[PDB]
Amino acid sequence: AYFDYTSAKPVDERILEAMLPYMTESFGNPSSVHSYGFKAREAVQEAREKVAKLVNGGGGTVVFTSGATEANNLAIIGYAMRNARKGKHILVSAVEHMSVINPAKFLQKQGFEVEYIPVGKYGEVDVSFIDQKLRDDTILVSVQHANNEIGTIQPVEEISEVLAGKAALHIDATASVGQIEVDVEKIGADMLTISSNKIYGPKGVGALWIRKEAKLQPVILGGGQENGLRSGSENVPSIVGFGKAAEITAMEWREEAERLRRLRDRIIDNVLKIEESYLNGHPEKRLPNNVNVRFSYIEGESIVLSLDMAGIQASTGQPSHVLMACGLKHEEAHGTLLLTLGRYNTDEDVDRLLEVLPGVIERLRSMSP
Amino acid sequence: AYFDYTSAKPVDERILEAMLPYMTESFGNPSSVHSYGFKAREAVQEAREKVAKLVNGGGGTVVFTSGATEANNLAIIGYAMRNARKGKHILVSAVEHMSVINPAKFLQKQGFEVEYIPVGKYGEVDVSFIDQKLRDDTILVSVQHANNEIGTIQPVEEISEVLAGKAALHIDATASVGQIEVDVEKIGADMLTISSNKIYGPKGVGALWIRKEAKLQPVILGGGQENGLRSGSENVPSIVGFGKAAEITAMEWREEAERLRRLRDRIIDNVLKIEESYLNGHPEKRLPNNVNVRFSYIEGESIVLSLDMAGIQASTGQPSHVLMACGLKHEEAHGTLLLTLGRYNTDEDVDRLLEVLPGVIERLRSMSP
Ligand SMILES: Cc1ncc(COP(=O)(O)O)c(CN)c1O
Ligand SMILES: Cc1ncc(COP(=O)(O)O)c(CN)c1O
Ligand SMILES: [Ca+2]
Ligand SMILES: [Ca+2]
Ligand SMILES: [Cl-]
Ligand SMILES: [Cl-]
């Protein structure tokens, strides 16, 4: 029973089917000026449209990348380096993915003033902090749409109203696309990170959606693909799969989200029956697929081990920077179990989790001094 | 009939077969600490071994990337930024791929002294130039193993002897792996770029092989995968395909090279029967898969168009920086046709090319004033 979807997902069989013809039969380079080239270019353009449409991104351009990490690097470093003449103050949430944090830290070494936005006890960013700390030399703000570790949905719409026409807003939507509504006009994104595999597309591809008139400096240099912003011969099969994923997700995500919510709530209601159990992240303003719970007197790693031994895959998340930002003590954060759900989970999976987990907690507590 | 293999290749059916299980069934993240994670990690390690073995790279480490462009960026910018305290003089060949040149140009903006190595009339780099221009503050030299446009094989072994224990040698081997012998001990590479699709693996993956004790600064920042040098969740299916490609290439490349040579020589012998036809690149020290010819009074683009119309895919290569570096005039470089061969070419393809091409040249010349 697999409850580790936020670490990796399976490629939907429908997506694979769409990809395969581009591997072997129609394998052209989109830059080539012959019929094989043309078909590849047409496939890429299509795929590009399907990704844009998913997030209502007609007001900007999709840039294909090798995944969310590269796209986050491009958003943070690409925008900041390109726009540094307008100011060098940057605001980054304390609970961002490391593929946003470490680029921010790189910019600190390049002379940018990076100020981290604190979060409250459920991991919600402090919007009054952003309003207070916003300056005329603030050029960029990065706040994730939601947190993939503790599930909390961020108030990005409220943030966008604070930042309107003063600083660019980068929103990492890796955890939210296909889970909750992601409309770059509603949330006011200027840049939006998207992961292919998080919507059951192929690994190894993703995108940064960039709003019209937002200028970036490329990170990857070369033959000038992606209109100069991201060089390298197009990975047409992965792009096509990503496109198919996006189209499928546009049609199916609302139903899937409700199904996952149903399984999530079953898990949470019952797991919290365990003595001295605690939910991490917001209990309602929360991704449909996320259950993050900690247990007194226990190590998360041993839960994960015990669950593995019983054929259940899970995660725990140097303790998590996210949990520490919410104010957990070292000992509290060490007892954390992360169950993340997905397209192929069943009621039987949840039955199985719920039959095993209470005894796992009991045994590990028997061991605590 | 497809003669544009250096723009894109088909994925070998055997490679696809190896990849597929990791798409849907065994889809774990190698960083995950459960059975799905373990299998993914084992697959990646294996694949990694198979790529290293192909280039005799036991004396270093394979770093997986999204392809040759990213790997070239990593080699040039990663090494240079990391080692800049030892000097900031860099030597780059005049005929390098743009995914080496544009990173070099980026470094020029960062205060590095980049000096371009000239080539002679067949595109061979001037080794006496390198010896003359090598200084105690030269930290890096980038010379491709061979040129994918004009086919010329570079004297990298001789270059390595000049540079032994004074400057790092980066060799872009994107055009050579699987065509000619690539042994990083024989050619003295400190960093070696490898492309997956160039050996009929999946697009969207490649590697930089890095010799032990060579230090690089990462370009892509995040979760610290690839031992910190290249962050991002592993694209396990593409890595596995790359690995399979490498294993297959180790076994089959010598036979394939001879077959391609046989087809190449047929083409060259007969195409040069055309009046005022000229081979570009060295006629013997040349990749088995490369035919680059120009024709007086003609535009390469119209040849390519005419060939497309007859169901033959080819290429022409702001004129090519490679051809201009060899000293061609604008008008000469504009008349260039690039036929690149591959695993699936047949004698019938060559028959077809040779039946069509002479009449194509005649018609286009009828049009010249
Ligand atoms: C010799 C050489 N170097 C590297 C590259 C870059 O490869 P890619 O566009 O697949 O990233 C190319 C272009 N196919 C090449 O032929
Ligand atoms: C919210 C979030 N941001 C982006 C990433 C980076 O994704 P990847 O490792 O696939 O590049 C992750 C890690 N899965 C994530 O969950
Ligand atoms: Ca603006
Ligand atoms: Ca050394
Ligand atoms: Cl909160
Ligand atoms: Cl020469």
Side-chain angles (χ1 to χ4, degrees), chain A residues 20-38 40 42-80:
Chain A
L20 287 181
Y22 293 97
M23 297 281 184
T24 70
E25 300 307 321
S26 187
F27 61 90
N29 187 322
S31 276
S32 293
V33 304
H34 49 62
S35 57
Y36 276 67
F38 307 149
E42 165 172 272
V44 168
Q45 291 168 342
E46 171 183 51
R48 196 185 301 281
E49 287 165 13
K50 295 183 174 193
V51 174
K53 279 184 189 139
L54 176 59
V55 300
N56 189 36
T61 304
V62 173
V63 179
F64 290 121
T65 68
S66 65
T69 289
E70 186 201 334
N72 279 336
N73 276 241
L74 173 58
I76 296 301
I77 297 167
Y79 189 89

Side-chain angles (χ1 to χ4, degrees), chain B residues 61-120 122-135 137-165 167-214 216-268:
Chain B
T61 304
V62 173
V63 179
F64 290 121
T65 68
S66 65
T69 289
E70 186 201 334
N72 279 336
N73 276 241
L74 173 58
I76 296 301
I77 297 167
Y79 189 89
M81 288 291 186
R82 182 55 177 88
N83 292 280
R85 247 64 283 158
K86 293 193 285 176
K88 294 185 69 166
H89 185 237
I90 301 179
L91 288 172
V92 177
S93 105
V95 296
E96 290 316 297
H97 192 268
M98 288 314 285
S99 68
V100 171
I101 300 296
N102 278 339
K105 286 183 171 180
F106 167 82
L107 295 176
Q108 291 183 293
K109 297 176 189 181
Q110 302 302 315
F112 291 83
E113 178 188 348
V114 175
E115 199 166 4
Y116 290 90
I117 308 152
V119 294
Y122 300 106
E124 300 163 282
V125 302
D126 184 343
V127 178
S128 62
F129 178 95
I130 297 178
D131 194 351
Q132 186 206 331
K133 299 304 192 186
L134 184 61
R135 317 198 301 243
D137 61 330
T138 309
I139 59 160
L140 177 69
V141 177
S142 187
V143 175
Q144 60 190 199
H145 196 179
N147 192 273
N148 237 337
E149 290 197 38
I150 63 177
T152 306
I153 295 170
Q154 303 292 356
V156 288
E157 302 87 352
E158 180 176 3
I159 291 165
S160 77
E161 285 171 7
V162 175
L163 302 183
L169 177 52
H170 171 239
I171 295 174
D172 185 351
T174 293
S176 62
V177 183
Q179 299 297 328
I180 57 177
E181 184 181 16
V182 183
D183 174 336
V184 300
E185 295 301 304
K186 290 190 186 187
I187 65 190
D190 295 308
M191 295 175 282
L192 189 91
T193 302
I194 308 164
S195 163
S196 172
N197 187 239
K198 288 275 147 96
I199 58 168
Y200 308 94
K203 290 171 184 187
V205 65
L208 187 67
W209 174 91
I210 298 152
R211 180 174 300 280
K212 178 187 164 187
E213 299 202 62
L216 283 81
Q217 167 177 314
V219 175
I220 299 299
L221 305 176
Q225 296 87 342
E226 301 294 306
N227 198 17
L229 281 181
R230 195 273 185 179
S231 286
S233 293
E234 294 87 342
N235 179 359
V236 180
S238 298
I239 285 163
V240 167
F242 189 12
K244 188 60 177 190
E247 180 167 78
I248 283 170
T249 294
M251 288 170 66
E252 301 190 346
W253 76 264
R254 291 197 183 265
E255 171 197 7
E256 192 159 87
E258 190 59 49
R259 185 173 71 255
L260 292 194
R261 185 178 310 274
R262 179 168 71 71
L263 300 180
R264 184 198 75 181
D265 292 344
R266 282 192 60 196
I267 289 170
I268 286 164

Side-chain angles (χ1 to χ4, degrees), chain A residues 43-120:
Chain A
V44 168
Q45 291 168 342
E46 171 183 51
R48 196 185 301 281
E49 287 165 13
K50 295 183 174 193
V51 174
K53 279 184 189 139
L54 176 59
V55 300
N56 189 36
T61 304
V62 173
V63 179
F64 290 121
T65 68
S66 65
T69 289
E70 186 201 334
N72 279 336
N73 276 241
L74 173 58
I76 296 301
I77 297 167
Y79 189 89
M81 288 291 186
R82 182 55 177 88
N83 292 280
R85 247 64 283 158
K86 293 193 285 176
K88 294 185 69 166
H89 185 237
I90 301 179
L91 288 172
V92 177
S93 105
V95 296
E96 290 316 297
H97 192 268
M98 288 314 285
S99 68
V100 171
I101 300 296
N102 278 339
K105 286 183 171 180
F106 167 82
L107 295 176
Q108 291 183 293
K109 297 176 189 181
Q110 302 302 315
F112 291 83
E113 178 188 348
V114 175
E115 199 166 4
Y116 290 90
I117 308 152
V119 294

Side-chain angles (χ1 to χ4, degrees), chain A residues 4 7 27 29 73 203 221, chain B residues 7 27 29 34 73 203 221:
Chain A
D4 194 20
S7 292
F27 61 90
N29 187 322
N73 276 241
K203 290 171 184 187
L221 305 176
Chain B
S7 292
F27 61 90
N29 187 322
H34 49 62
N73 276 241
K203 290 171 184 187
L221 305 176

